[PDB]
Each structure stands twice: as C-alpha cells, then as structure tokens.
Design a protein around this ligand. Structure first.
Ligand SMILES: NC(=O)c1c[nH]c(C2CC2)n1
Ligand SMILES: [Cl-]
Length: 165
C-alpha cells in the first residue's frame, strides 16, 4: 500500500513525492487531480497526470465536457484513473491566480469524503495560487476519509510538516 507517509491526523497522511510516481507505484483506487472547470490538463498536477496517461485523460475529459459541460469551482467528477489508478477524482479547487474565490476550497475538499481512501495533491496549491499551509489546514479540517497527500516540492513539504498545528 502507501509507504513512507508522515501521519498528520487520524486520517490525513503526507509525503514528499511526485503524485504521478506514487500513483504508478501504488495504483490506488482513487487518485485526485487538481482540475480546472474545463478539465484542460495543461500544467501543474493536471498536466503531469495527463502526460503520464499519454493524453488518454485529456481525450476522456474532452468527451466528458462535450456531454456535461464544465464543472463548478469546488466541484468534481469521477473519471477513469487510466494507468495510474482505478479512478481519477477531478476536483476543482479555486484558482486564486485566475481571481477565483478562496472560500470554495472547503467545498472542493468535501468531494474527498465520497471516497474511503485517496491519493491526492494539496488543492489550490502550486499554480492555483493559494497558500499551501491554508490548503493543508482546510484539508485536515474538512476531509474525514483517508487522504494520502503527495507534495512534490521538498521545500514546501518540509515547511508544511514543520508548521503543522
Ligand atoms: N505540480 C505538482 O504538484 C506536481 C506533482 N507532480 C508533478 C510532476 C513532475 C511533473 N508536478
Ligand atoms: Cl502546481
């Protein structure tokens, strides 16, 4: 199963790891993608996960959007996990850089509660522009299911662990 994770709370775990490599190794039931409303997996975690699927995630996502329209900020959809996981839970955290509402981060993390265990990134962190310390706090205070957070950046991982209340 998941290895080398530091236990933050009863249900939240964290590791300095590339979520793509964690997914290829563990093959979890659910890998969370840091999606946007259009499921356009260009960069950040989404670009990395999509590149690992050889663009199959993007092809599937475009068909999903053609049928259903865009997701809501704070919303999610379950699609295939391709070669990475059984499922991919595409969750849209607010992108502060695109001027979206940071109050929607709690709604975004609530999607994780529909799955007993997930491999996930820190929502709205990185190129989404939110404070990762705040994202981890919202995660621990919102998610009740077992979440294994893979934080790519070593310096951020150390900062998150050392400042965790
Ligand atoms: N942006 C990220 O959080 C992230 C995680 N994994 C990767 C892969 C190296 C491309 N990027
Ligand atoms: Cl990012």
């Amino acid at each position: 199963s998941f290895s080398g994770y530091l236990k933050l709370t009863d249900n939240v775990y964290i590791k300095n790891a590339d979520i793509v490599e964690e997914a290829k190794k563990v093959k979890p039931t659910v890998v969370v993608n840091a999606a946007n409303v259009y499921l356009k997996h260009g960069g950040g975690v989404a670009g990395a996960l999509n590149k690992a699927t050889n663009n199959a995630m993007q092809v599937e996502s475009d068909d999903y959007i053609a049928t259903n329209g865009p997701l809501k900020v704070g919303g999610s959809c379950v699609l295939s996990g391709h070669n990475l996981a059984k499922h991919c839970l595409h969750v849209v955290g607010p992108n502060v850089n695109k001027g979206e509402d940071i109050q929607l981060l709690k709604s975004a993390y609530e999607n994780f509660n529909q799955h007993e265990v997930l491999l996930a990134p820190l929502l709205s962190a990185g190129i989404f522009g939110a404070d990762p310390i705040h994202s981890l706090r919202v995660c621990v205070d919102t998610v009740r299911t077992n979440v294994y957070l893979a934080v790519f950046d070593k310096n951020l991982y150390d900062k998150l662990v050392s400042s965790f209340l």
